[PDB]
Each structure stands twice: as structure tokens, then as C-alpha cells.
Design a protein around this ligand. Structure first.
Ligand SMILES: CC(=O)O[C@]1(C(C)=O)CC[C@H]2[C@@H]3CCC4=CC(=O)CCC4=C3[C@@H](c3ccc(N(C)C)cc3)C[C@@]21C
Lengths: 11, 241
């Protein structure tokens, strides 16, 4: 679930 | 004399100290040590993302490119940062994961992952031999974030290539701060970039350890997910040599 976490963090 | 503006900017966006939340006033168990590392890893990931957004050129890229680059770089960035801290704080004699989580030689051996420790310990040792400067480290670090792209390439491919080229020039400026002369500078650039190239191999090892440690704590879904990060021919590495 890293991709999701990376995406939320970028926004 | 003075430090180049971009490198100075890089110094100012360096993440501040991140504690593992580890208690040293009590002996460690295999459970607590691994728990401390995972907690530190999660915190360090958010820091990598936060650091990347302050990086000149990074925001110009499509959101999908930004995600991809971080997915293909977080491991390298984390082990490179560990290398620097171990180098600066304890002369590379032990692994400085955080101020409250320092693993000396005797502790690495007693652990169930001494092999992994020795692999990671390779970087601080190299920093000691090369006597890497802070300015060089900062430029090299950015280059790691821009060292791997997908086989098809990125959406903002041209913007990416330009950004990569700018940091290559900055590294050359960092080298020039101490290496006076075109022959010495050229020799330094080869040494540092060779080191960067070698990290492509070393990081695959770390991904395997991670995948194997998962299996041991607990099926084809798990394997297939990590495979692209341990196997060759899956992504496109950008080599200097
Ligand atoms: C002993 C062992 O097997 O460790 C690993 C494992 C449990 O498989 C294998 C390599 C490890 C890795 C190497 C680089 C690293 C440097 C640091 O300054 C703190 C955490 C950190 C970690 C840990 C880490 C890193 C990231 C994350 N997340 C959530 C992104 C979680 C833990 C745990 C990892 C993955």
C-alpha cells in the first residue's frame, strides 16, 4: 500500500 | 570561497533529525528491533516525499512521474542517508540509523541479519575511503532519485532529462570546490559516479532481504509484487559507465 501512501503524501 | 546557490539550497531542505522511538535503557529482542526499524522506515518515507517536493525541477513533472521515481528510489535514498549519518557521526564504525538507534559491530553480529548489516555497511566505508564532502553527498543523493525510469519512459521525459543533466553539472561544481584541476576533477567524477552505479546492484539485495523477511514473518501475489525490484530487465537503470 506504498503507492497509495506516496500519492496521498504528494498531495 | 562561497558555496554554489543550488547546493546551499539542497543543504537547507535536508530533513531534520528523525528518532526511531527506541528505548536504549533496556535490552533489545528480535521483535522490538525489527519493530523499531519498520517505524523508522515509515517516518523516513514521509520525509523522502516531503524532501522531493522542495527539490527544484521535481514539481514540473507529471504527478505519475513523481510517484514512480519515489517508488524506484526510496530504498536507495534511505540506505544512502544511513551511510552519511554513520560516516559523519561515528566515522563509519557503526550503523547510525537514528540518534536513539545506533547498531555497533557486536550488536550487528548478535542480530538475525548480520549479513544485511555488512551489505549496508559498505557505503559508510566507501565514504570514509573517498572522504566524500557534504556538497558532493547532496548532489549524489538527488541523482539517486533520478537514476531509474520505466522501460517506456516518463510522461515528462524531456523535463526529466534536463533536471538530471542539471544535477550532474552541480555534482561537477561540488567536486570543483576541492579538486583543483581538470584531471583530478575528472578522476573524482568517475569515482563518485561509479559508486552511484554500484548502488543499482546493492539495492536489489536490500529488496530481496525485505521480501525474504516478509515471508519469514508470515502467496504468489506477494512474490510478483516485489519481483520488479529484485530482477533485472524489469526497469531501465541510468548508468554513467
Ligand atoms: C532487518 C530487515 O529485514 O530490514 C528490512 C526489512 C524489515 O525487510 C530490509 C532492509 C531494511 C531497510 C534498509 C534501509 C533503512 C534505513 C534507515 O535509516 C531506516 C529504515 C531502513 C530499513 C527498514 C524499513 C525501511 C522502510 C520501511 N517502510 C515502511 C517504507 C520499513 C522498514 C527495514 C528493511 C526494509
Amino acid at each position: 500500500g506504498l503507492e497509495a501512501i506516496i500519492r496521498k503524501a504528494l498531495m | 570561497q562561497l558555496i554554489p546557490p543550488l547546493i546551499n539550497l539542497l543543504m537547507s531542505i535536508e530533513p531534520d533529525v528523525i528518532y526511531a522511538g527506541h528505548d536504549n535503557t533496556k535490552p533489545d529482542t528480535s521483535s522490538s528491533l525489527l519493530t523499531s526499524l519498520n517505524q523508522l522506515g515509515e517516518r523516513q518515507l514521509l520525509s523522502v516525499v516531503k524532501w522531493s517536493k522542495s527539490l527544484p525541477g521535481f514539481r514540473n513533472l507529471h504527478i505519475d512521474d513523481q510517484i514512480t521515481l519515489i517508488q524506484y528510489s526510496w530504498m536507495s535514498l534511505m540506505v544512502f542517508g544511513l551511510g552519511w549519518r554513520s560516516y559523519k557521526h561515528v566515522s563509519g564504525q557503526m550503523l547510525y540509523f537514528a540518534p536513539d538507534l545506533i547498531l555497533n559491530e557486536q550488536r550487528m553480529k548478535e542480530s538475525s541479519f548480520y549479513s544485511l548489516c555488512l551489505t549496508m555497511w559498505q557505503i559508510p566505508q566507501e565514504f570514509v575511503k573517498l572522504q566524500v564532502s557534504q556538497e558532493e553527498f547532496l548532489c549524489m543523493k538527488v541523482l539517486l532519485l533520478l537514476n531509474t525510469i520505466p522501460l517506456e519512459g516518463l510522461r515528462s521525459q524531456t523535463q526529466f532529462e534536463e533536471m538530471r543533466s542539471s544535477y550532474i553539472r552541480e555534482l561537477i561544481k561540488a567536486i570543483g570546490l576541492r579538486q583543483k584541476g581538470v584531471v583530478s576533477s575528472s578522476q573524482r567524477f568517475y569515482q563518485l559516479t561509479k559508486l552511484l552505479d554500484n548502488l543499482h546492484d546493492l539495492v536489489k539485495q536490500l529488496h530481496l532481504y525485505c521480501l525474504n523477511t516478509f515471508i519469514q514473518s508470515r502467496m504468489s501475489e506477494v512474490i510478483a509484487a516485489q519481483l520488479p525490484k529484485i530482477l533485472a530487465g524489469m526497469v531501465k537503470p541510468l548508468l554513467f559507465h
